[PDB]
Amino acid sequence: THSHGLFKKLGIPGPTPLPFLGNILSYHKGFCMFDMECHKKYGKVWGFYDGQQPVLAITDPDMIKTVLVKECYSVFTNRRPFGPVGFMKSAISIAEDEEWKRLRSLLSPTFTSGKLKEMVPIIAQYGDVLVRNLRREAETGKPVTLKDVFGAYSMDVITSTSFGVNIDSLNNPQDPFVENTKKLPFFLSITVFPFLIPILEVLNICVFPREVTNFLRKSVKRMKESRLVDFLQLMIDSQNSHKALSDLELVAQSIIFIFAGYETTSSVLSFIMYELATHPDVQQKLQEEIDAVLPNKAPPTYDTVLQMEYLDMVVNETLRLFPIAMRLERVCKKDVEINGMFIPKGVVVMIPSYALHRDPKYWTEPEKFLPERFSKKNKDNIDPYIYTPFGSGPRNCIGMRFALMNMKLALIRVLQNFSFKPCKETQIPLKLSLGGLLQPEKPVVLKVESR
Numbered sequence: 001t002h003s004h005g006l007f008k009k010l011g012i013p014g015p016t017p018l019p020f021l022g023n024i025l026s027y028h029k030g031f032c033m034f035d036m037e038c039h040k041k042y043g044k045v046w047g048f049y050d051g052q053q054p055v056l057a058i059t060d061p062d063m064i065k066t067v068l069v070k071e072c073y074s075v076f077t078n079r080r081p082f083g084p085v086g087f088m089k090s091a092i093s094i095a096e097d098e099e100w101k102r103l104r105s106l107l108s109p110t111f112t113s114g115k116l117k118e119m120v121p122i123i124a125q126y127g128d129v130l131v132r133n134l135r136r137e138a139e140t141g142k143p144v145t146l147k148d149v150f151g152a153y154s155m156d157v158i159t160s161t162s163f164g165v166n167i168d169s170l171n172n173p174q175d176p177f178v179e180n181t182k183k184l185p186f187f188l189s190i191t192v193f194p195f196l197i198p199i200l201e202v203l204n205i206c207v208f209p210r211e212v213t214n215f216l217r218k219s220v221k222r223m224k225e226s227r228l229v230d231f232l233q234l235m236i237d238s239q240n241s242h243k244a245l246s247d248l249e250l251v252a253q254s255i256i257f258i259f260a261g262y263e264t265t266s267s268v269l270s271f272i273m274y275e276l277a278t279h280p281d282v283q284q285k286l287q288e289e290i291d292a293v294l295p296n297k298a299p300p301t302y303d304t305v306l307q308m309e310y311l312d313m314v315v316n317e318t319l320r321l322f323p324i325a326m327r328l329e330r331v332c333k334k335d336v337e338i339n340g341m342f343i344p345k346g347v348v349v350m351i352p353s354y355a356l357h358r359d360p361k362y363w364t365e366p367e368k369f370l371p372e373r374f375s376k377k378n379k380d381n382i383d384p385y386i387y388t389p390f391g392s393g394p395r396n397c398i399g400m401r402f403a404l405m406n407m408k409l410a411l412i413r414v415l416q417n418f419s420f421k422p423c424k425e426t427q428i429p430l431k432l433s434l435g436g437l438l439q440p441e442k443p444v445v446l447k448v449e450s451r
């Protein structure tokens with residue numbers, strides 16, 4: 001301190017920071033709105049300060065590719081640290097440098113296409129649970145809260161695809177597992193006071209409610225020593241050139257996968273159903289495609305899901321509008337130059353995906369939900385370093401193909417059986433949480449009718 005002269009020195013523009021707070025008061029309307037304003041106010045690069053922490057936003061695609069792919073191992077290896085994390089330091093998305101590289105290797109084969117194909121039957125079964133739970137509300141002409149019913153399904157897939165546990169968490173009961181996973185303003189104080197992280201790490205306050213972590217640490221070792229197709233097994237089989245996965249490390253990845261696949265899968269489904277309800281022609285076109293590929297509500301398979309091109313377009317265009325990461329970030333670990341621009345050590349480089357996905361300079365009518373932008377005709381004109389809903393380079397979303405498959409199997413089975421209509425209580429137009437997550441302000445409620 002005061003680092004608040006850094007961008008002024010390098011001649012990079014940006015909004016003037018306030019002492020101690022940097023630019024964070026500018027987050028009051030949300031990260032996303034701030035990034036769009038900076039994009040329009042300042043052009044291709046700009047800097048700002050989370051507290052004392054310099055953040056350099058970059059929007060040039062070549063420069064993005066340099067940061068995410070070309071210089072990843074050498075410079076831009078880690079994300080911005082947050083805490084306190086406790087033992088979750090060993091989790092893949094949080095770990096750093098060689099320890100992350102290791103964990104990436106031990107977990108990468110778990111997410112192959114081949115392994116994903118063997119997970120489809122198990123992921124198929126809970127699609128049926130999803131329909132029946134939906135019908136009980138469709139037969140009772142009462143509006144439905146999608147996040148609840150989609151969460152129940154996403155919850156259902158996680159416990160099965162990661163541990164073998166099998167529940168209908170929606171109704172079926174207070175089964176011992178649904179509840180510790182229920183615990184599925186503090187994080188802002190971190191940024192003005194990031195020097196308090198090591199404080200909280202010697203105090204063992206875990207952002208992961210220390211009890212849940214205590215529940216699964218023992219829960220895993222119950223499962224481990226009971227067996228001795230799912231993620232736990234795929235990881236246990238792995239610990240049988242890198243030191244094998246420890247027993248606590250395995251747990252920490254389990255936790256990351258539960259987090260990853262719960263509110264992401266559920267929220268993206270809710271975003272998709274909102275678009276399909278408020279664009280009835282897309283919904284019908286999708287329903288026809290599904291009936292053409294799977295006549296008589298034939299059960300979807302891995303191969304038939306990959307066959308559905310309009311399904312893919314609907315999914316991709318939704319992710320354009322609602323990229324739930326909002327931003328991609330890498331810590332600069334060395335003095336470097338990329339594409340004719342100096343970057344000093346310790347700067348956080350940030351790619352503002354939300355802003356890039358809704359930038360008129362690449363997207364016509366960016367606010368409109370228009371699946372055709374992803375027609376095999378048009379999909380080729382889309383810069384992969386502008387549309388980046390799963391990141392890019394060695395540190396992109398490891399769960400990407402699982403998550404696309406998991407969501408699509410849900411949609412297919414659901415669209416075979418129901419149509420989705422707006423209720424008077426639907427928020428139209430949907431608004432984003434002014435807060436820190438990409439979620440709707442009010443939850444998505446829609447009318448559900450049986451075909």
Ligand code: HEM
Binds near residue numbers: 400
């Ligand atoms: C639609 C759902 C999802 C989306 C849009 C999504 C998106 C992302 C994005 C944008 C990143 C950052 C990548 C980067 O910085 O370049 C990421 C990281 C990650 N995601 Fe996902 N994700 C989703 C679901 C999942 C699921 C289901 C898993 C299951 C395990 C998962 C596991 C991970 C992991 C482990 C990382 C950290 C990768 C690493 O640091 O090596 N994600 N995800």
Ligand SMILES: CC(C)(C)OC(=O)N[C@H](CS[C@H](Cc1ccccc1)C(=O)NCc1cccnc1)Cc1ccccc1
Binds near residue numbers: 259260261325
């Ligand atoms: C800005 C603040 C500090 C408020 O919260 C974050 O920093 N939020 C996370 C960073 S840990 C994240 C999820 C998580 C893990 C433990 C406890 C809560 C949450 C994780 O790794 N989840 C797997 C995942 C999540 C979403 C998409 N795909 C994969 C979000 C994150 C986004 C992209 C890459 C890595 C992390």
